Structure formats: structure tokens, C-alpha cells
Design a binder for this molecule. Structure first.
Ligand SMILES: N[C@H](COCc1ccccc1)c1csc(NC(=O)Nc2ccc(F)c(Cl)c2)n1
Ligand SMILES: CCCCCCCCO[C@@H]1O[C@H](CO)[C@@H](O)[C@H](O)[C@H]1O
Length: 334
């Protein structure tokens, strides 16, 4: 039935968790996190107690979005939920939400440490990012903030996409410019930036501020062509682009000296200024770069995700009751 809970003071609050979660050890103070050992499954886990989840309409709305999103994500290369619990026995005593996931003690920076990786290692890591992206994108979700710190990787370089949200170095140029109709290929831009860095051992676009970032990008990809200029709604944006000194797109072979030509080719297809022209995640997985990994029969797709439900304007007690239903309805994975 209901598990037996135990109480323990941790992170300046009294945590109340199932007996199955042992040796809680704080690893951070959105919400505070402890590392634990799950005696039921035999896994090391991260247990997150949400901070102030139902303090305001906004916090309530965010708690619900976060829970619904994590419950929906069921893929090897994306973070998922091992468990969700509340010590509450009713809606009326319900106030705290805890989320449980695989403990991931390293991100892509922790494993890569500014060093060149081998080409075979890059194929495996990027393959996994694109396999997870195919799945996220198939749900009609855009990550919007893919970077090394949002990618968990175990010592065996098995990788999961996360969202915890220099922080600007992997952002698509349109995002830097506050465009308002992004497509999924904003994430593909980020993947190109990550991929370039893994190969070379160096940040591709290490901008010092917002405008320097755009400057570095344009130096590599070129100033916008006529086709792209035709798609610019903003009269000021237009005027500005028209007064630029046309630089040709650099040749990526003379930037990524030494690299597998297949890698250089993929990067050319990812880092195209015009978002409409960037390769998609599904296309990228079929690219010859990934021949040793690609398997069309095990690159699964998600059920559709309804984002209008979290975009409602509801009362706190309404979001709290809806979040409660989500807690109670959780079914752990096999
Ligand atoms: N700061 C916590 C500490 O980790 C502990 C923990 C424990 C249990 C459950 C979750 C996290 C954290 C890190 S990552 C995360 N949440 C998401 O990444 N959500 C999310 C949103 C949109 C997406 F598209 C995807 Cl792919 C993922 N929260
Ligand atoms: C200073 C020049 C910056 C380059 C302009 C960004 C081009 C990005 O590409 C643009 O993406 C938009 C956002 O989804 C789409 O609506 C457009 O169709 C697409 O061309």
C-alpha cells in the first residue's frame, strides 16, 4: 500500500521519504536535492524536494508543468522519473512534492574537461543527443537551452538530456535576437556548437557579451543572404542587415582542420544561419557520420504532448489539485 515514511532534517527542512530511499546526502539547495540509495531497485538516485511549489499561481503552474513534462518523457537519452511522492494522505494535507530520478554525478563538461575527444567518442555522444532530440521534438517540444551543463553523462559516456533551467555560447542567433517564432532547429544549432567543441577542444563561439556572440557567429556562417533577408519582418533588423559588409561563409574544412570529413559535413548542415535550412534531428541520425550507431528501428518517437494545459490561467488550489492528481496517477517504469 502506502509506503512507510521516515522523517529527517536535511537542507534546513524536515524531509519525509519512503524507507526505500536510504542515506540521504544533500547535493544542492527551484528546489533542494539529496543523493540517495534506492534499496528497492538497487540504484543511486537524486531526490528533489520542490521549494515553495504552491506559493503562487506561477510556482503552482511551474510545478505542474515540471511534473507533467517529466512524467511524459520516457526515452534512454532523456531524463525521466523513477518516482514521485508526497507524504500527504489527502489533497487537504498536500503541500510537498518530491521527484526521484537516476543520480547523475557528472555533466558533459565534467567528463570532457576542455580536451579533444576522439572522433569515435564524438560520434557516440552526438548520436545520443540527436536520438533524445528526435524524441523530444516528436512531442512538439523545443528544448531551447541545450548546452554541456544540461547533458548528464555517466563514466561510460551514456548520456541523458536534462533541463536545469558562457550560458549564451550554445544559443541559436535568433534566440540571441529575441525572434518570437522559433523552430526546433534552434536545438540543432546548439548541437553543432557542442559537437564542434568536442572535436576541437574549444568553445566554438566564446562571446564576451551579447553582441560579441553575434559577431563571432557571423564570422563563421557569413552575413545573411537575399533569401534569408526576405524573411525578416522587423524593419530595423532589415535596415541593419542591409548596412553590413558582406562576408562569405567561412569554409568549415579550414576551421576544423584534421577532422573526419563526415563530421565537417554534418557541422555545415547544422550551423546554417537560416533556421529553415538546418538539418533536423531525424535527418541527422541518418547522416553517414553515425553509420556505426544509427538504427532506424530503435530511434523511437514520443506520444504528443499537450502544452496548452500548463498554459492556463488558473487558481492556486486548481493547480495544486491538478498536480495532486498527477502525483497519485504516477506509474513507475518497468
Ligand atoms: N535541479 C534539479 C536537480 O536534479 C534532481 C532531480 C530529481 C528528480 C527529478 C528531476 C531532477 C533538476 C535537474 S534537471 C531538472 N528538471 C528537468 O530537467 N526538467 C526537464 C524539463 C524540460 C525538458 F525538456 C527536460 Cl528534457 C527536462 N531538475
Ligand atoms: C543578424 C542575422 C541573424 C540571423 C537571422 C536568424 C535566421 C534564423 O532563421 C530564421 O528562423 C526564424 C525563427 O524561427 C524563422 O521564422 C525564419 O523562417 C528563419 O529564416
Amino acid at each position: 500500500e502506502r509506503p512507510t515514511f521516515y522523517r529527517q532534517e536535511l537542507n534546513k527542512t524536515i524531509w519525509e521519504v519512503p524507507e526505500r530511499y536510504q542515506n540521504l546526502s544533500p547535493v544542492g539547495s527551484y528546489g533542494s536535492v539529496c543523493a540517495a540509495f534506492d534499496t528497492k531497485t538497487g540504484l543511486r538516485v537524486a531526490v528533489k524536494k520542490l521549494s515553495r511549489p504552491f506559493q503562487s499561481i506561477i510556482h503552482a503552474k511551474r510545478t505542474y508543468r515540471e511534473l507533467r513534462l517529466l512524467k511524459h518523457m520516457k526515452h534512454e537519452n532523456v531524463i525521466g522519473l523513477l518516482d514521485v511522492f508526497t507524504p500527504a494522505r489527502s489533497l487537504e494535507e498536500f503541500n510537498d512534492v518530491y521527484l526521484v530520478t537516476h543520480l547523475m554525478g557528472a555533466d558533459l563538461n565534467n567528463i570532457v574537461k576542455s580536451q579533444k575527444l576522439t572522433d569515435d567518442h564524438v560520434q557516440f555522444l552526438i548520436y545520443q543527443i540527436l536520438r533524445g532530440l528526435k524524441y523530444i521534438h516528436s512531442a512538439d517540444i523545443i528544448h531551447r537551452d541545450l548546452k554541456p551543463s544540461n547533458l548528464a553523462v555517466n563514466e561510460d559516456s551514456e548520456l541523458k538530456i536534462l533541463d536545469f533551467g558562457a550560458t549564451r555560447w550554445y544559443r541559436a542567433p535568433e534566440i540571441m535576437l529575441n525572434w518570437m517564432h522559433y523552430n526546433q532547429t534552434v536545438d540543432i544549432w546548439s548541437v553543432g556548437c557542442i559537437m564542434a567543441e568536442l572535436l576541437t577542444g574549444r568553445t566554438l563561439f566564446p562571446g564576451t557579451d551579447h553582441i560579441d556572440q553575434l559577431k563571432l557567429i557571423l564570422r563563421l556562417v557569413g552575413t545573411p543572404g537575399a533569401e534569408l533577408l526576405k524573411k525578416i519582418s522587423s524593419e530595423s533588423a532589415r535596415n541593419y542587415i542591409q548596412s553590413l559588409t558582406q562576408m562569405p561563409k567561412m569554409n568549415f574544412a579550414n576551421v576544423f582542420i584534421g577532422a573526419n570529413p563526415l563530421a565537417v559535413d554534418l557541422l555545415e548542415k547544422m550551423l546554417v544561419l537560416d533556421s529553415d535550412k538546418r538539418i533536423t534531428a531525424a535527418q541527422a541520425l541518418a547522416h553517414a557520420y553515425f553509420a556505426q550507431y544509427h538504427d532506424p528501428d530503435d530511434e523511437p518517437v514520443a506520444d504528443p504532448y499537450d502544452q496548452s494545459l500548463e498554459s492556463r490561467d488558473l487558481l492556486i488550489d486548481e493547480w495544486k489539485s491538478l498536480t495532486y492528481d498527477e502525483v497519485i496517477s504516477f506509474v513507475p517504469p518497468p
